[PDB]
Amino acid sequence: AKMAFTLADRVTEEMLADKAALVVEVVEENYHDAPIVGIAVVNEHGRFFLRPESALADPQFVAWLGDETKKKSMFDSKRAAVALKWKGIELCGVSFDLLLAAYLLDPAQGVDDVAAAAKMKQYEAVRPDEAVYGKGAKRAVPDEPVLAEHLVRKAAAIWALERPFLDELRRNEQDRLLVELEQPLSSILAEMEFAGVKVDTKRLEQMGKELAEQLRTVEQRIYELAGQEFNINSPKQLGVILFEKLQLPVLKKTKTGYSTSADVLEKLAPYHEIVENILHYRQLGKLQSTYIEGLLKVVRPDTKKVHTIFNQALTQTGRLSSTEPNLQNIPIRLEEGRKIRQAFVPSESDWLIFAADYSQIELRVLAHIAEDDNLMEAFRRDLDIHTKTAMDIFQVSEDEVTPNMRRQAKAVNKGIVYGISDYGLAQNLNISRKEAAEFIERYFESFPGVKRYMENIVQEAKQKGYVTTLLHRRRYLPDITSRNFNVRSFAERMAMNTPIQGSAADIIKKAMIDLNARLKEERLQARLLLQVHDELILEAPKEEMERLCRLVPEVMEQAVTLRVPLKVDYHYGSTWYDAK
Template sequence: MEKKLVLIDGNSIAYRAFFALPLLNNEKGIHTNAIYGFTMMLMKILEEEKPTHMLVAFDAGKTTFRHKTFEEYKGGRQKTPPELSEQFPLLRELLNAYRILAYELDNYEADDIIGTLCAEAEKEGFEVKVISGDRDLTQLASEHVTVDITRKGITDVESYTPETIQEKYGLTPKQIIDLKGLMGDASDNIPGVPGIGEKTALKLLKEFGTVEHLLESLERVSGKKVKENLEQHRDLALLSKQLATILRDAPLGITLEDTKYEGYDLDKVVALFKELGFNSLLGKMNVKEAEEETAHLASIRYTIAREVTESMLANESALIVEILEDNYHKAPILGFALANENGNVFIPTDVALSSSLFRQWLEDGEKKKSVFDAKRAIVALKWQGLDMKGIDFDLLIASYLLNPSHSTEDVASVAKAKQYVNVQSDESVYGKGAKQAVPDEPILAEHLVRKAAAIRELKQQFINDLQENEQYSLFTELELPLTFILAEMEYAGVKIDVERLREMGEELNEQLKTIERDIYQLAGQEFNINSPKQLGVILFDKLQLPVMKKTKTGYSTSADVLEKLAPYHEIVEKILHYRQLGKLQSTYIEGLLKVVHSDTNKVHTIFNQALTQTGRLSSTEPNLQNIPIRLEEGRKIRQAFVPSEPDWVIFAADYSQIELRVLAHIANDPNLIEAFRNDLDIHTKTAMDIFHVSEEEVTSQMRRQAKAVNFGIVYGISDYGLSQNLNISRKEAANFIERYFASFPGVKQYMDDIVQQAKQKGYVTTLLHRRRYLPDITSRNFNVRSFAERTAMNTPIQGSAADIIKKAMIDLAERLQQEKLQARILLQVHDELILEAPKAEVERLTKLVPEVMEHAIELRVPLKVDYHFGPTWYDAK
């Protein structure tokens, strides 16, 4: 069998992945874009290359033997962004799960490890594939070594062999070192010879072969200036070549045998993918169809009911209402299960729903019911014409409050936290994906009964834990009541003016056609606007716009490049607009039309109450929290959201700067508190402080930057993150953050104090005792610890803001009922509540809604609510 060694330049690929992909987060808030990109590349390599040996080489530290030769080596490089640094420990975990050797060597670079292993592998008859984002490694190419350099994205590579290097540069692989010696390398701060670029260097090397031969033959060099530069900087040329040379004999502490690859650890990879939220990658893994859990389950006694009798029902029961589909609106109910003092019973759907006795029991508020995911059960039954009452315990919500980072996919995943193993996972019973199916009745019945029994068994343990954590009132007074309100909102849905939405689609199509014609006219020809290659030719070859960034396939036409080019030609703004409208059309207009319920002409979004670690609600199917509103055409999509009754209006009320107000309260900062109590514009106030100017001198640019700093502080932003947001240098961004803390010392004190508290307790809490555990807060790894510290600062602010709006929803629903108003809450979007109401009630709502929302929780600063209303959601803004 052919021996094949794959060597990966770990730091280089991680960097490439980080900057190629947007900043992704998993549900714990950890950045994952570099790991995701790295994993995609890894999966592609394993599939295509089928290596027998494998290694990922990392740089060991900032200094290497090259720094002794040239102190400024790599001196121009910026500090690694913390958003990337925090991903390296998880990258090591990934490689461990894949059973791939990760190796670093003090005083040497990853390149030297790779170069040395290449030399050894060639002697042993291996075929070698090197993967990096750094073209320096092309010098290693040989008859048996191919070097793949990433270009567009992370999985698209360009392969270098001696033949391709000859074809591209007219050089041998070894001459790549001479090329660097002459032209230098800005990324590694290799100086090269001043005045000699790639073109001149290639010409000289084709004539003289090496740097040494060139320097010995200066009398034959044509061009006075080039010759002078080479004479004056002879030492620099030789030094640069030395710095660019990859070692082939580094003193490695490993052998080729250590790099042997025998496949990954499936369980570890699957567990890590789940932790990181890589659901799309999970689908590509060879996961077993069903786990052999049944062998570990203790026997359980139950009956299958063919009719419902009084003896099956009790004053207190655990209840399962089983729906398999993720979108449970109008989804079929597979069956019911009860566990109570009278025993365990499975009731088939037709038996249950045709029984008046069972229906009365469901709707009896005196009959207490413990469930898993109350909202799901309530909504499913509402579609069956049943209004379930009496729910006093929800295992999903209880588990989520006790630790929001634990998996709450099904009863089994929650039960595992308490070492309760007498229940199977849903996936093991139903399968997953295309192979998902409902089993025969005996298997289904036992599974549902086991789930009901688990809820009954675990209920008191969870209640005890909530009480011990001072979270029982958070459970009973906030989250459980909210479940019922969210169920009402989901079932009610939001009316969509389908015709208006279609009209908007047609209007967008017309706009796209007009912009397309304008672009063709400005370009002087027709071309495929959606093709980066064709667009690059038009912009940079034909219109001669300055080239901002190049890729191996041509010119970059990414959004950030186009934004920089906008001042140079009016075609650029048109192209940006064209792209934005295209996304609106496909993602939002067509996307919304797909999910409008055919019977109701409404969208029935699903609010996820037990997902985020901060306590924020999210929504899916459709995601109504993500409709773009920065672009006017995006805002117009809200015109399609209308009241469900004639002569009604949409009424929207949102908290103004709630997170900054929460920060002022928690940090107890006098300057911040004073600003809010005096109703000052907080961004103007911050601009005055960090720029040391009077109110009159604050420009719109200063206010914009101050706003980014204000909200950035809330999110624990780093200087790198702020620099990206404002398109400024990291030094300037760090300066802004420093000046902010000088202006608001209470905020700085709070951040220092909360980190210390988190280290002592292992968690942080919100104003209403919602917890977030931070096991990494005492990690020895600086990057892992730093991320946990930023999370400690941010969670009490975000989480308390989430608590406040949830409390406001409960209080508002209660007041609307008390005052016998017909108005009802439709949506919660970030810090905004959207209602629909009869026009006759609007005047009452303009007083009642702000009053309720502003007094949901009393803070040191006033809460402020803005409201608007109109015939559509668009008009209510």
């Protein structure tokens, strides 16, 4: 049903109204220095398609994109913004972003294109991107006539839906969450990704060579112990050597057949010398293949930086997500892996990396929302919460809390936050189910308000159909009413966990917005680089380091007021690794 639209040869004044639906199409998944293939505008005066080359050599048009008074509605404005930044062009005045609007309304829907959003409000006059571009190897930009129609249909759909979405957002009391939190956050994220993080490639390469040598050493040793040669990365091949040939005990079974997971092999270490070498092999293999080679692929040879993409509209809890590369899972737990962080360096000379992290934010949030007196009081005293929990479940004095008692108390705390069952805790603490249920029972005696909260929250999700966060983020949990025990059980755990994890997301988001405002007021050159759930990473001049030590934590700490204080720790140094 051909939609009417002008395929313009040049930009005209009536295309630059102070209110428009704009589509700036970037079909590359990774939008960094990626082409723009089409522009559509839809407004009071009609519907228009433009060609980038024309539209972007045009001062009038670029002035308009840049103009903050001229208000745009879009879908995934960060994608457009970053693609335009790589071309030296600024995008401002995005008053409404449908992708973020749909995301707040229902993360479960998985809305990843305009069509998905449109179905939510019964609008079907737009095609799914995957249908116009195909998928995988057949991904292709179409001919002008087909492209032109699709862009305009998305612009047109954005035009039609903004009011319907803002109405529902308002009804959920999520309108401020879109306009004050997520949409501003999108601009800060656009800057972060474009700035990117500088990498020392020679430092990486050297590490690759050392690993290479060590992998060969341990690999040969494995063959020698095995008494033959086999592919160690092959489950089928490794299982045979471990369980048929060396006759090691079959502790666990996979769908495929044999389980060679770490927690399994560690149990088998005593029987044979070959097990410890294999775990080590894999550990090394993992760093070489994922983190050295995978990183060296994505470094941009020109700028010497990696430029991640932060997904703002993906997780079910309101958290961010990072890809190409993921900088939110760089090794930190074992020193061998941790060293990788020495490869991440400031972008200018005489600058330093500055890391700031919240301390036990999830448990602090639980205390606040649960209103547990015993937990509130623990954090007001600034105690060690795991040592404290140990004391309370084991009924002992600080003097008597052994490292094992702590480790155990800690596991209980995570479990409460993830809302696990006696079985899950038993699996984690490697103890009997009865013992696990004794711990939990003890925990709830020590913290009755937390118990009260878990019961009440499951009941509220049952009554309302969703659970909310502090800043009115929302998550629907249909399965909570399901008659299957396992499906219902999982729903209840989400019921318990989401307001904790989700409210923590909200807090750090606000901190990021607040922090940005302060950095500008202060006219500081410091800049945000990464966010890893409970921490922010910046780079700034050595001269600016002392000020940031006061400023960054103050801003993060005052983001919200709760019944307990928030606590931030910081460090800085010449590399990410040294900011410890």
